[PDB]
Symmetry: C2
Subunit: 93 residues, 2 copies
């Protein structure tokens, strides 16, 4: 009943909807990835400042070297990004 | 404004409250870890079945080898656990 329980569900709930837009829901594509980070984290991840950076980000996600990113790869990185988001807050003071 | 934005905040919001119970909010202790996984994921992580498993889990979290777990270490693992939670759902059918 904790908020975290809701959050794990939240990640999947957003993933299911967004991934469905293209290809397999279970598989995340670079476009979808760009759109998820860009739209959900337009501020913290504001990729617009550096479009090239998207490729750099995907490269880290593709452990396989396949060139395509899996949700499993995505979840590991998002955990790091949320923490990184705090850095932005630190800028405030 | 996406749900994910709320979720990143949710993780920190729960972390701030729980970690504060003991030691440094910024530092996560084994007790607090046990309580967070056990209470927030009493079902999916039901550590009660295997108390010994808690040590196994912390060991993976401590990259440093310090024996103490940091939130940074915790966030990486939680991302994996949420996905693992789905496995439980799979059992349904
Ligand atoms: Ca997809
Ligand atoms: Ca891959
Ligand atoms: Ca603490
Ligand atoms: Ca450590």
């Amino acid at each position: 009943g904790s908020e975290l329980e809701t959050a794990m569900e939240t990640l999947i709930n957003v993933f299911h909807a967004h991934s469905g837009k293209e290809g397999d829901k279970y598989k995340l594509s670079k476009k979808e990835l760009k759109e998820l980070l860009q739209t959900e984290l337009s501020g913290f991840l504001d990729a617009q400042k550096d479009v090239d950076a998207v490729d750099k980000v995907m490269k880290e996600l593709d452990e396989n070297g396949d060139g395509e990113v899996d949700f499993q790869e995505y979840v590991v990185l998002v955990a790091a990004l949320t923490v990184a988001c705090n850095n932005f807050f630190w800028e405030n003071s």
